[PDB]
């Protein structure tokens, strides 16, 4: 969808896949303010929305935490709390035509700056003059939406680039898109440091024979020390025995 009617899509409860994003060389404008561009798998934003538009040329650079211009006045606006990122694409004959593109529109005439993350779709007359504008195209009554003009050219600033914006929510509900992997296989009968789902310790992971309840994860002793932990891969309970130590 074009900038005049910019489309959004929320991402539901799933495991976020962000590793293949920076590894792709197809992105040339991965500049964004907020969290670090490396700790994406270690984030717990509640909800994520993706907004897409097909703005053209050097107009993309106006996307910043606070900026005014022909694009960020009566269209997609970026506030100072826009936590997330912006991604740009490259245009080609895939989005182009020899005759030209005329099905795309952009707002040009309005009366007041649009609020951040707001859309205003009502296009009859912007009433430049004080004369009545009951729906007759003429002087002091002009149509505020103009069609894009796209032709095969140099492409430095005259191509329909594809720009998406990912926006994150800070804190209104607990998040569900926090997926780490750590890709580690089990080891038994030998001393090892373990980080089983937040339980950091050291010991030997022997074979257990207890009867943990289905909703229980780890056991405990009388003196309140960890004794057994449920590995959530085969859902298996494993005991913990301290490293052998003593005097000489």
């Amino acid at each position, epitope marked *: 969808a074009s900038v005049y009617a910019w489309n959004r899509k929320r991402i539901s409860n799933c495991v976020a896949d962000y590793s293949v994003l920076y590894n792709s060389a197809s992105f040339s404008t991965f500049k964004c303010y907020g969290v670090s561009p490396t700790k994406l798998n270690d984030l717990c934003f509640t909800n994520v929305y993706a907004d897409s538009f097909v703005i053209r040329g050097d107009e993309v650079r106006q996307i910043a935490p606070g900026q005014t211009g022909k694009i960020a006045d009566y269209n997609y606006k970026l506030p100072d709390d826009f936590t997330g990122c912006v991604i740009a694409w490259n245009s080609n004959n895939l989005d182009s035509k020899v005759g030209g593109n005329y099905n795309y529109l952009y707002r040009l005439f309005r*009366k007041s700056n649009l609020k951040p993350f707001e859309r205003d779709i009502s296009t009859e007359i912007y009433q430049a003059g004080s004369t009545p504008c009951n729906g007759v195209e003429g002087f002091n009554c002009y149509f505020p939406l103009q069609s894009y003009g796209f*032709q095969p050219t140099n492409g430095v600033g005259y191509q329909p680039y594809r720009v998406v914006v990912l926006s994150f929510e800070l804190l209104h509900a607990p998040a569900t898109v926090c997926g780490p992997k750590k890709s580690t296989n089990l080891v038994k009968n030998k001393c090892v440091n373990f980080n089983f789902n937040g339980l950091t310790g050291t010991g030997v992971l022997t074979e257990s024979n207890k009867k943990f309840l289905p909703f229980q994860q780890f056991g405990r002793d009388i003196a309140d020390t960890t004794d057994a932990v449920r590995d959530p891969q085969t859902l298996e309970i494993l005991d913990i025995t301290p490293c052998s130590f003593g005097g000489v």
Partner: single-chain antibody
Framework: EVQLLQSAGGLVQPGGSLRLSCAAS????????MSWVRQAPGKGLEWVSV???????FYADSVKGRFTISRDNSKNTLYLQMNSLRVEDTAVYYC????????????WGQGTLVTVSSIVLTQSPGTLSLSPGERATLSCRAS???????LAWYQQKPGQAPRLLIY???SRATGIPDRFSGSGSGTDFTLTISRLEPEDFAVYYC?????????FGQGTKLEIK
């Protein structure tokens, strides 16, 4: 009947302050585009500032910050305050509404004069002295090779305000006689005037918009052999 009035006919002391004024004659200034252009006598015209609806201020590339432009809806005015003035700032300060996509600078102001103490766009043909009774060709080349419809043509007049001839190089403005034609694509645009009339010998300018700061041509005058 649209009229734009200015009052800036006053010499400025060095390092002094001035206040210009542009009025309105029926159209609200809070809902339309306005632009300021420097006539630069003896050379091509240039850009100064633009005010969108709203009131965000856009300045030219060479000049930054010092010029203070404001819009006053109470008195329907387009005030521009001039700070400390330096050398080589003597020109005219036209103001005009802007509808770049559909009609480029349809109506302009009238003109004034401010004194001092004590995109690569070119026009090819030149003076091209001729006589009435035939046509002529004026070629305007651009380095950035704008795609379709971001170039327009204006007509200067000695002592008067510039007037729009064709917007977008495809269709002429309202009231323009049908003897003006335009063509060309890619890099250059050609303008042709048929059956030249006595009220046609005037300087033609080609200007670019819809891009980095607007640039006008150097100036092509029409003179009789």
């Amino acid at each position: 009947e649209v009229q734009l009035l200015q009052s800036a006919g006053g010499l400025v002391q060095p390092g002094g302050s001035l206040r210009l004024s542009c009025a309105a004659s029926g159209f609200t200034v809070s809902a339309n585009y306005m632009s300021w252009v420097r006539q630069a006598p003896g050379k091509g015209l240039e850009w100064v500032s633009v005010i969108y609806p709203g009131g965000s201020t856009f300045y030219a590339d060479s000049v930054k910050g010092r010029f203070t432009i404001s819009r006053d809806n109470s008195k329907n005015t387009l005030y521009l305050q001039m700070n400390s003035l330096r050398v080589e700032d003597t020109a005219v300060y036209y103001c005009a509404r802007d509808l770049s996509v559909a009609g480029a600078f349809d109506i302009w102001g009238q003109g004034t004069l401010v004194t001092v103490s004590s995109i690569v766009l070119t026009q090819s043909p030149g003076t091209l002295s001729l006589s009435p009774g035939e046509r002529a060709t004026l070629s305007c080349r651009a380095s950035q090779s704008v795609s379709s419809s971001y170039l327009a043509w204006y007509q200067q007049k000695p002592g008067q305000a510039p007037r729009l001839l064709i917007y977008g190089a495809s269709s002429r403005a309202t009231g323009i006689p049908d003897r003006f034609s335009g063509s060309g694509s890619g890099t250059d645009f050609t303008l042709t005037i048929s059956r030249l009339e006595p009220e046609d010998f005037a300087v033609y300018y080609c200007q670019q918009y819809g891009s980095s700061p607007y640039t006008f041509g150097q100036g092509t005058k029409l003179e009789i052999k």
